């Protein structure tokens, strides 16, 4: 809702058909009469090249934004599901590495206990005699 | 809340039933059935035109 | 503000150079793909001819209700499209009834001119 | 599904990060070894430049695909309205000129019905 | 062939040049605006840094249902999955605590048995004397 020469709210928004940028009819016309050019791109432009006045014709002045809103909320749904899944699988790695290493460390005890036991009867039967 | 309660929000169960000699309300409901049935019959035409080619490509 | 095809506020508007008219990129492309023309002026235009040229987000209010809104809005647009087409058929139909009377009347004038011509001959005698 | 250089079904697809296009590794590798470039855009590309995670996907079928479907519905129906807005502006324009020619002619029917009867009223009396 | 955020099959895939991973444009464009970095590698990434790279779904023969039945199922399936996924994340953290506690419980056994065994072996070496 702004002209691209002065910066005012344009009451007659006309556009140049070389670089897409909505100017105001007064300012663009003064730029063309100064030098036949587009102010933004410095390309060739004339007064007849400009498309002036509002466009509403066979159109009539809701619905489409509801679908846009439905997209915007889904966009969050996906973003949330990602971060929830990352932590899901990243914790499963800790779970898996632990359970494996737990039962691995558990076998240390089974071995250790039977050797400790062997030391007892050995020494006991020796110290006896 | 929908997942916890185990209840999905009800949609428009209206277009399917309707009734003839109704009122101004069923005059609308009737006119709804026409436009969607024409859209339906147009929506089945562009499917059958390609037919199984569009399906087997996927 | 409004694209002159659908009536939406365009989210990627494009202007035709044959006729000064800001369309929406999606809708103008479909028309050109159907027939290489401009929808308003019927001038020969192509897709490369188009020059790609406010966004304010709708905050409905304070979700199950939004389901039924979208249902109602599609239900309304379906009837707002239907009502506008039966009116077109009946305005053309009532126009055709005028054309018959228009051409039927100018045949009835020919007989009335003969009765005037017959009268002008008798008056002179 | 296809390789853009050969046109075959690539058995080891590797996507480049300068011109986004799925090339066959064995084909594109030789293209890079010839000259360090991407075949399509002719931008620089090396072999290391050539290349989901934990979220499981399902195939693209008839939420996002459903939302883009409803765009097609409305965007097509919007053009359907133009066919009846444009045709209405021709019928009403022909009706306006038709009713004007009817209104301009019926004044002349009213005068001839006066004049032909007045000539019969005049002549019969004499 | 899929997107690396939502788990989609993208309609306009775009690849980032810092980490070779294909995302769907909307979802990667959202992440960069939220926090300007690559979601996977956590490396600096902008919207201009992205590089853009057809899919067919056969709309069912019985395609009313799109408004009522299909859309209903989509928001059911989104709702009951993430709720069940939140249930899965909660148990992984609880089962984490049972893993680490049982692990540390085993560490104490080993430490206790390491003092036990070698001293039992030492006593056999001393017995000879």
mmCIF file of C-alpha atoms in Angstrom, chain D residues 10-117:
data_model
loop_
_atom_site.group_PDB
_atom_site.id
_atom_site.type_symbol
_atom_site.label_atom_id
_atom_site.label_comp_id
_atom_site.label_asym_id
_atom_site.label_seq_id
_atom_site.Cartn_x
_atom_site.Cartn_y
_atom_site.Cartn_z
ATOM 1 C CA UNK D 10 19.625 -44.909 -12.627
ATOM 2 C CA UNK D 11 20.668 -47.768 -10.296
ATOM 3 C CA UNK D 12 22.616 -45.419 -7.982
ATOM 4 C CA UNK D 13 20.972 -41.961 -7.908
ATOM 5 C CA UNK D 14 22.986 -39.034 -6.524
ATOM 6 C CA UNK D 15 21.535 -35.504 -6.429
ATOM 7 C CA UNK D 16 23.829 -32.505 -7.050
ATOM 8 C CA UNK D 17 23.780 -29.334 -4.877
ATOM 9 C CA UNK D 18 24.140 -26.674 -7.629
ATOM 10 C CA UNK D 19 21.661 -27.741 -10.333
ATOM 11 C CA UNK D 20 19.056 -29.752 -8.493
ATOM 12 C CA UNK D 21 18.595 -32.858 -10.643
ATOM 13 C CA UNK D 22 18.854 -36.635 -10.007
ATOM 14 C CA UNK D 23 21.891 -38.067 -11.847
ATOM 15 C CA UNK D 24 23.250 -41.632 -11.945
ATOM 16 C CA UNK D 25 26.428 -41.770 -9.809
ATOM 17 C CA UNK D 26 28.513 -43.709 -12.361
ATOM 18 C CA UNK D 27 27.477 -41.293 -15.144
ATOM 19 C CA UNK D 28 27.865 -38.018 -13.232
ATOM 20 C CA UNK D 29 31.167 -39.180 -11.695
ATOM 21 C CA UNK D 30 32.668 -39.446 -15.186
ATOM 22 C CA UNK D 31 31.221 -36.029 -16.087
ATOM 23 C CA UNK D 32 32.973 -34.531 -13.044
ATOM 24 C CA UNK D 33 36.249 -36.335 -13.826
ATOM 25 C CA UNK D 34 36.084 -34.915 -17.373
ATOM 26 C CA UNK D 35 35.632 -31.363 -16.031
ATOM 27 C CA UNK D 36 34.546 -30.173 -12.574
ATOM 28 C CA UNK D 37 31.057 -29.031 -13.597
ATOM 29 C CA UNK D 38 27.351 -29.819 -13.370
ATOM 30 C CA UNK D 39 26.126 -31.064 -16.802
ATOM 31 C CA UNK D 40 22.880 -29.014 -16.924
ATOM 32 C CA UNK D 41 23.748 -25.497 -15.661
ATOM 33 C CA UNK D 42 27.550 -25.711 -16.237
ATOM 34 C CA UNK D 43 28.156 -24.489 -12.659
ATOM 35 C CA UNK D 44 31.129 -25.864 -10.680
ATOM 36 C CA UNK D 45 30.613 -29.192 -8.906
ATOM 37 C CA UNK D 46 32.969 -31.716 -7.313
ATOM 38 C CA UNK D 47 32.396 -35.375 -6.373
ATOM 39 C CA UNK D 48 32.037 -34.505 -2.645
ATOM 40 C CA UNK D 49 29.434 -31.852 -3.579
ATOM 41 C CA UNK D 50 27.285 -34.655 -5.061
ATOM 42 C CA UNK D 51 25.147 -36.503 -2.477
ATOM 43 C CA UNK D 52 15.176 -38.767 5.563
ATOM 44 C CA UNK D 53 16.350 -39.440 9.156
ATOM 45 C CA UNK D 54 14.058 -40.698 11.971
ATOM 46 C CA UNK D 55 10.505 -39.568 11.013
ATOM 47 C CA UNK D 56 8.826 -42.375 9.016
ATOM 48 C CA UNK D 57 6.950 -41.354 5.860
ATOM 49 C CA UNK D 58 4.012 -42.863 3.926
ATOM 50 C CA UNK D 59 3.411 -42.599 0.139
ATOM 51 C CA UNK D 60 1.864 -39.471 -1.482
ATOM 52 C CA UNK D 61 -1.879 -40.260 -1.690
ATOM 53 C CA UNK D 62 -5.284 -38.563 -2.106
ATOM 54 C CA UNK D 63 -3.460 -33.929 4.603
ATOM 55 C CA UNK D 64 -1.194 -31.773 2.347
ATOM 56 C CA UNK D 65 -2.288 -33.564 -0.825
ATOM 57 C CA UNK D 66 -5.911 -33.065 0.265
ATOM 58 C CA UNK D 67 -5.350 -29.310 0.808
ATOM 59 C CA UNK D 68 -3.757 -28.801 -2.612
ATOM 60 C CA UNK D 69 -6.757 -30.740 -4.018
ATOM 61 C CA UNK D 70 -9.190 -28.156 -2.611
ATOM 62 C CA UNK D 71 -7.214 -25.395 -4.351
ATOM 63 C CA UNK D 72 -7.792 -27.149 -7.688
ATOM 64 C CA UNK D 73 -11.508 -27.338 -6.843
ATOM 65 C CA UNK D 74 -11.903 -23.626 -6.077
ATOM 66 C CA UNK D 75 -9.453 -22.322 -8.702
ATOM 67 C CA UNK D 76 -11.393 -24.219 -11.393
ATOM 68 C CA UNK D 77 -14.776 -23.075 -10.043
ATOM 69 C CA UNK D 78 -13.521 -19.464 -10.087
ATOM 70 C CA UNK D 79 -12.980 -19.749 -13.864
ATOM 71 C CA UNK D 80 -16.472 -21.262 -14.153
ATOM 72 C CA UNK D 81 -17.780 -17.958 -12.748
ATOM 73 C CA UNK D 82 -15.950 -15.952 -15.452
ATOM 74 C CA UNK D 83 -17.669 -17.974 -18.192
ATOM 75 C CA UNK D 84 -21.018 -16.753 -16.734
ATOM 76 C CA UNK D 85 -19.893 -13.190 -15.803
ATOM 77 C CA UNK D 86 -18.532 -12.564 -19.313
ATOM 78 C CA UNK D 87 -21.530 -14.158 -21.058
ATOM 79 C CA UNK D 88 -23.887 -12.123 -18.836
ATOM 80 C CA UNK D 89 -22.233 -8.877 -19.987
ATOM 81 C CA UNK D 90 -22.986 -9.783 -23.633
ATOM 82 C CA UNK D 91 -26.608 -10.832 -23.039
ATOM 83 C CA UNK D 92 -27.464 -7.770 -20.930
ATOM 84 C CA UNK D 93 -25.735 -5.551 -23.513
ATOM 85 C CA UNK D 94 -27.800 -7.121 -26.319
ATOM 86 C CA UNK D 95 -30.928 -6.923 -24.130
ATOM 87 C CA UNK D 96 -30.298 -3.214 -23.454
ATOM 88 C CA UNK D 97 -30.042 -2.440 -27.173
ATOM 89 C CA UNK D 98 -32.961 -4.792 -27.929
ATOM 90 C CA UNK D 99 -35.320 -3.201 -25.387
ATOM 91 C CA UNK D 100 -34.222 0.263 -26.619
ATOM 92 C CA UNK D 101 -35.051 -0.661 -30.228
ATOM 93 C CA UNK D 102 -38.369 -2.067 -28.913
ATOM 94 C CA UNK D 103 -39.059 1.170 -27.013
ATOM 95 C CA UNK D 104 -38.036 3.294 -30.016
ATOM 96 C CA UNK D 105 -40.160 1.231 -32.455
ATOM 97 C CA UNK D 106 -43.409 0.884 -30.407
ATOM 98 C CA UNK D 107 -43.888 4.675 -30.566
ATOM 99 C CA UNK D 108 -44.015 4.283 -34.367
ATOM 100 C CA UNK D 109 -46.512 1.382 -34.148
ATOM 101 C CA UNK D 110 -48.706 3.662 -32.007
ATOM 102 C CA UNK D 111 -48.588 6.442 -34.629
ATOM 103 C CA UNK D 112 -49.296 4.204 -37.646
ATOM 104 C CA UNK D 113 -52.268 2.661 -35.827
ATOM 105 C CA UNK D 114 -53.391 6.291 -35.347
ATOM 106 C CA UNK D 115 -52.625 7.393 -38.945
ATOM 107 C CA UNK D 116 -54.071 4.376 -40.798
ATOM 108 C CA UNK D 117 -57.281 4.551 -38.731
#
